Amino acid sequence: DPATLAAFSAAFRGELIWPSDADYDEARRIWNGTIDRRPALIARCTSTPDVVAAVSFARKSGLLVAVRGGGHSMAGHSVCDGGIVIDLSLMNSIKVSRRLRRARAQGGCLLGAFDTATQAHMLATPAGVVSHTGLGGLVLGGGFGWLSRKYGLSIDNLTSVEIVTADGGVLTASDTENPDLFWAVRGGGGNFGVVTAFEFDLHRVGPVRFASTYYSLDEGPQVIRAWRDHMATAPDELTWALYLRLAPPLPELPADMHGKPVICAMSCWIGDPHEGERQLESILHAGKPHGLTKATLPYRALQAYSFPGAVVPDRIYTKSGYLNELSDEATDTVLEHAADIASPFTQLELLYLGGAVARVPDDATAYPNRQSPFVTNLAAAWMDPTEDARHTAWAREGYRALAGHLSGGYVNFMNPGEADRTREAYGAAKFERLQGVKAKYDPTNLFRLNQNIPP
């Protein structure tokens, strides 16, 4: 309808990428490569006007909007099948203040670009763990990493946003402005508009003592029991996480471990590094550490470490869910399907959150399950588009085989066929509450390609 297309390009200094321009089959590809979808319009917005135009445009056309910052939607929400892609990867500017300990970042940032500007001043705020993950879809779901047990979720450090809502208007959501919207972006997602800016508190993070070993699966059941036990009685500065996987062919690992399911235990001490080598070594030798690696490295080097760059996988499938305990038998059943790992890319991720996250009132952010400390995540990953079921089944037949021991679920780990879990994840009180926020701000559900909340 060239009536709309007419004055869009009038107010659009960015770039449009049609299904004919050469760079289309590469701009419609996202990080989860099981997603062969074909949009009809790519907008690489470059400023807030570029977003308001596209959102006004995409309204005045009725196009299924897929918004996109980093592309790491483990459900494929960042590319639509025939709509418009409001792409923000070039909204990537950052302002950092050494003395205000304030940061300010556009919505298309990657974590690495954010951790590189703040660490120029020996600063940081908690965010994800892999650097090319986008800052948008992560922060709009809560977002956790190594700083989270000490400094909380990313939403706990967010002071204000700038958001472009469905009607084509630009707001400012803080605690003194649209606190309803601010309550809902912090854990809701795109549902309520496109966020063109964030503002974070920062924290002085210097070097950290980091260690990562690869215990053997046979000694597994006690380590998981050591890990489960010790993190319930652990200080906020101890961040420990277990990843079950095939041992990479790395020269610090014996060849008689290469390819066989091991336990990768990655730990860091967010404080004085000498209390690091004390508090770390008290937990390092619960099993027999193999492939050992310790270092006193800066935070920005810790965020770029994960994971061990064997490769970046093309095809992934994840099944997540929160936990409250870890029954002795589930511990036996995660070790049951660790010896069934098919590819060296799938990980069975056991993370103990809690810390400064759990010390936050539930009804303070739209993020659910703060009082849940354990987060499990059967993340499959593979290369062969014809081995799709063997890996996808290992997640299903492992998610299910303990789905009674699970509560809720992280929205940012959801798979494509999983919109049915938005109530189960958020809970009836957060959902019912997020309903009337969408009703006010997204009264038409203009932003529907997410873990959606209908008004």
Ligand SMILES: Cc1cc2nc3c(=O)[nH]c(=O)nc-3n(C[C@H](O)[C@H](O)[C@H](O)COP(=O)(O)OP(=O)(O)OC[C@H]3O[C@@H](n4cnc5c(N)ncnc54)[C@H](O)[C@@H]3O)c2cc1C
């Ligand atoms: C390798 C890997 C590691 C991860 N590590 C962590 C971790 O440590 N902690 C954690 O909490 N999560 C983690 N995640 C999950 C991650 O937060 C989600 O995948 C998130 O959706 C990625 O955001 P993105 O913007 O990069 O992806 P996208 O595909 O661009 O976005 C996905 C969703 O976010 C929305 N969105 C993105 N940007 C904006 C914006 N500016 N305005 C409005 N809506 C927006 C989209 O509309 C869509 O619904 C990880 C994921 C991967 C793949």
Ligand SMILES: [Br-]
């Ligand atoms: Br679609």
Ligand SMILES: [Br-]
């Ligand atoms: Br990755």
